[PDB]
Write a structure and sequence with these properties.
Elements lengths: L2 H9 L9 H7 L6 H8 L6 H10 L7 H8 L15 H16 L9 H9 L4 H13 L8 H21 L1 H10 L3 H4 L1 H5 L8 H14 L3 H12 L1 H5 L3 H14 L4 H13 L4 H14 L1
Helix pairs in contact: 2-13, 3-13, 4-8, 5-6, 6-7, 6-8, 7-8, 9-10, 9-18, 13-17, 14-17
Length: 287
Amino acid sequence: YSWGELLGKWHSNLGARPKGLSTLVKSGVPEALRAEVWQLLAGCHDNQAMLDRYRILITKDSAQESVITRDIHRTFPAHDYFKDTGGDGQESLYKICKAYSVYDEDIGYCQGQSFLAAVLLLHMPEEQAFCVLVKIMYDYGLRDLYRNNFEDLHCKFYQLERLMQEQLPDLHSHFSDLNLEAHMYASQWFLTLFTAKFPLCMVFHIIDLLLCEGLNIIFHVALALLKTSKEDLLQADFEGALKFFRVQLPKRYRAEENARRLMEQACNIKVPTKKLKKYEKEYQTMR
């Protein structure tokens, strides 16, 4: 089945996902089609109200200049589009982040959010990147992870640990012996959607899957990463395991072949909503 046939049908029934979308996203959106598909998946249709709002938000001043500026100078600094500090990429990135800090009047701009903005900007006009970023934060519930001094993120750490305990017991046993807990290695995984440390070709694939199947995909990729790395991690001590996550693990998905396979593995791995429910309740009652 093809993206050509699928988009043809999508465009003739705008408010409804056509069949076979999931199987196609699983293999990955062709780079060339991402601007269009991502905006379809997120329910962005060249909105005029949002365009006019954005043009006003980029004229307002933000409290988080310094947090944004800090993040921008370290967002994909080896990529040609973002390398130089006076460049059009960084400027556009600045406008997006500044517009989000004003748009979201409870959370504002969050540390590491510029990595996600950048991924979107690479594929679409600045302003469209803003709209998809707003969608991901609000509709896909990414901003809720930050809410309440990170309440729901902590819940999500518990869930991954219980999933690991059920699906990777040897690794869970070894992590238990080391007191290596999920909040030490998995915070950027959940908060930045891997865009904080992982390679562009890897994270583009992540955005494909997230926008289609929602935030639960992070569980799938986290577990696939842990599974493929089992033997490295099993021989690691405390400091080694963290150094492995922060430095060695990202380098392994720099190429399109290794990124494609990991997403395949992530999609074969089952994270039943029921089981997530179970663990969420377990956690909820604790506090």
